[PDB]
């Protein structure tokens, strides 16, 4: 279960240097030890190592060994991973996990990159022409030209969570495009509004746009 | 590094159908202290990992007990005695025994389900890009089966196939289907300049490609 806070997305250059955190809010990690598990877009999970955060003692991986990190600070209930001399290779998603009821941290993407952060324009998609499907509405949302990953996309501030169809980032020129549509009775849409929640972590970019009625397209 | 092998790589189920997933170490996963350290991990696209089994058969909270593990020294096997929906996504088997803990390259489990025919959806580009000089043309293909799909754009009967960024969601935890989303992006002038605008899929589901036209100045 997703129990832990880790630190937003990292863009960092080639050859620097970073430091992932890993925290709780409802419980002292020193009591459980916490371990980091990586993984590069579209392949397995790889373990880094493990820490016993309340005296700092850690084994790392052979593959880490000197490339990685570990130290746990008990005073502000915080662990982490500090990562040198970065590569292509090392961009991927950074998981902590704690001894302690299979508790999870939600993932740090980290983009080793030397492009630039770009925060997104974000557009609503009000359908035409009066379309419906048996009696039903969908709505849309255009994430466009951000860089780089995550965007979280939510719908009525995540209340509307049912019949929503988040799709995966494309990248194209240094630039990603990501869209999401919400599926909605006709009775809702446009008598109750309809809000496309939009958050750029790296640039700390927040954006609301609310799906109007179009005017004559 | 004791190596962690999983048999399939792939797992295509009927809805309904008993599943296995096997996992074979590379050297023995009994420790001294008699226990086996072998768990098995689930993870749905895009989320963090969560855990099913523990000490090769203890089932987590929570986790059905359509799910079992059993095995000892170099072969493990997870059982799902019947699979649901919302069993899609990677399964891994993962071992603490030795140092460094290795993991399994994941089981990719799919279900098979019947036929589904997309729904199709076209949004003109909002004023707001068009303001901003852009404009994209937004085509979504909604809850179709199986995953391969094609489209094509044509504008004013012309197909165009510069511009267009397609992606794919994974199977539906619910449904089981999938959904696609193909934007062709222009400029406000090449956009203002034309009239038609059409997506257009070819599915296994029909003879002929289900088209949706959007025409300026109409609605």
């Known amino acids: 279960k997703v129990k832990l806070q880790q630190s937003g997305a990292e863009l960092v250059r080639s050859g620097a240097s970073v430091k992932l955190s890993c925290t709780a809010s409802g419980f002292n990690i020193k009591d459980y030890y916490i371990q980091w598990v990586k993984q590069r877009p579209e392949q397995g999970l790889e373990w880094i190592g493990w820490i016993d955060p309340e005296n700092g003692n850690s084994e790392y991986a052979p593959r880490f060994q000197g490339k990685a990190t570990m130290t746990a600070d008990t005073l502000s209930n915080t662990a982490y991973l500090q990562l040198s001399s970065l590569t292509s290779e090392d961009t991927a998603v950074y998981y902590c996990?704690?001894?302690?009821?299979?508790?999870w941290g939600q993932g740090t993407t980290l983009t080793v990159s030397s492009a630039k952060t770009t925060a997104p324009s974000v557009y609503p998609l009000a359908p035409v022409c009066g379309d419906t499907t048996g009696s039903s509405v969908t709505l849309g949302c255009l994430v466009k030209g951000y860089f780089p990953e995550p965007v979280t996309l939510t719908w009525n501030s995540g209340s509307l969570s049912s019949g929503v169809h988040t799709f995966p980032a494309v990248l194209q020129s240094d630039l990603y495009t990501l869209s999401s549509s919400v599926t909605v009775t006709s009775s809702t849409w446009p008598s109750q509004s309809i809000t496309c929640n939009v958050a750029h972590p790296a640039s700390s970019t927040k954006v609301d746009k609310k799906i109007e009625p179009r005017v004559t397209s | 590094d004791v190596v962690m092998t999983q048999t399939p790589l792939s797992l295509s189920v009927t809805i309904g159908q008993p599943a296995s997933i096997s996992c074979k170490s590379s050297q023995s996963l009994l420790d001294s202290d008699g226990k086996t350290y072998l768990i098995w991990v689930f993870q749905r696209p895009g989320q963090s990992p969560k855990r099913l089994i523990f000490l090769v058969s203890k089932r987590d909270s929570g986790v059905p007990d359509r799910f079992t593990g059993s095995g000892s020294g170099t072969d493990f096997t997870l059982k799902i005695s019947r699979v649901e929906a919302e069993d899609v996504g990677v399964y891994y088997c993962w071992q603490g025994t030795h140092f460094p803990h290795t993991v399994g390259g994941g089981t990719k489990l799919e279900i098979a389900r019947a036929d589904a025919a997309p729904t199709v959806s076209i949004f003109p580009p909002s004023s707001e890009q068009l303001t901003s000089g852009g404009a994209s043309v937004v085509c979504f293909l909604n809850n179709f089966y199986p995953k391969d799909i094609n489209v094509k754009w044509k504008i004013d009967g012309s197909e165009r196939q510069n511009g267009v960024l397609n992606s794919w969601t994974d199977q539906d935890s619910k449904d089981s289907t999938y959904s696609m989303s193909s934007t062709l992006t222009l400029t406000k002038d090449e956009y203002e300049r034309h009239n038609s605008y059409t997506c257009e899929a070819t599915h296994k589901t029909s003879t002929s490609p289900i088209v949706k036209s959007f025409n300026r100045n109409e609605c």
């Open positions: 996990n704690a001894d302690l009821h299979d508790y």
